[PDB]
Amino acid sequence: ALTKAEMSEYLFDKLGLSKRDAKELVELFFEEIRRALENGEQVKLSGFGNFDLRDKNQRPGRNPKTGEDIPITARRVVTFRPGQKLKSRVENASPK
DNA sequence: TTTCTCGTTCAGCTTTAATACAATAAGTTGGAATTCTAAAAAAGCATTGCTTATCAATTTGTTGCAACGAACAGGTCACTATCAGTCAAAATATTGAT
């Protein structure tokens, strides 16, 4: 699984950047994105996807184990709509 | 046989044209880097029955990665004694007067 460790190492052998800043950029990368989502801003990354924010209302739910119907509290989640470019590169993938 | 016959380079001289001397004021020519802009590519537009994701409440295996504890630099201040620099000690050479 791709981790921040592998991402930093990549920037070291592709951009020749020290692992230090290579590890600091990967952190600030996801950080800045999370700061935009929490602030209520859409994140549109061309050639990748789009992190949307939809306010879901309180809908009926339950306890998957027993079956006790419990109303799922409303909350703002963070969806991800992959671009057409990304889909065309993952359409022919393979779980490995 | 013996004599008539010309072009070359050497060397000590003489003569014909361009460039002088300097500080001053730009001009040329190969790029480098920031920013305007048309050229390209990804995405919104457009829509509907059918397909797929939405997720609580709680137990159990998994894992990214910060949290620290040392070691290897990374960068600045001190150890330890005399260089680094400039004035006086100590008495007469040298210079001035009898």
From Swiss-Prot:
Residues 48-72 are annotated as: Disordered. One of its GO terms (molecular function) is DNA binding. Keywords: DNA recombination, DNA-binding, Transcription, Transcription regulation, Translation regulation. GO terms for biological process: DNA recombination; positive regulation of metabolic process; regulation of DNA-templated transcription; regulation of translation. InterPro entries: Hist_DNA-bd (IPR000119), Histone-like_DNA-bd_CS (IPR020816), IHF-like_DNA-bd_dom_sf (IPR010992), IHF_alpha (IPR005684). GO terms for cellular component: cytosol. Signal peptide: none annotated. The keyword Acetylation does not apply. It comes from the Bacteria. This protein is one of the two subunits of integration host factor, a specific DNA-binding protein that functions in genetic recombination as well as in transcriptional and translational control. Belongs to the bacterial histone-like protein family. Heterodimer of an alpha and a beta chain. This is Integration host factor subunit alpha. It comes from Escherichia coli O45:K1 (strain S88 / ExPEC).
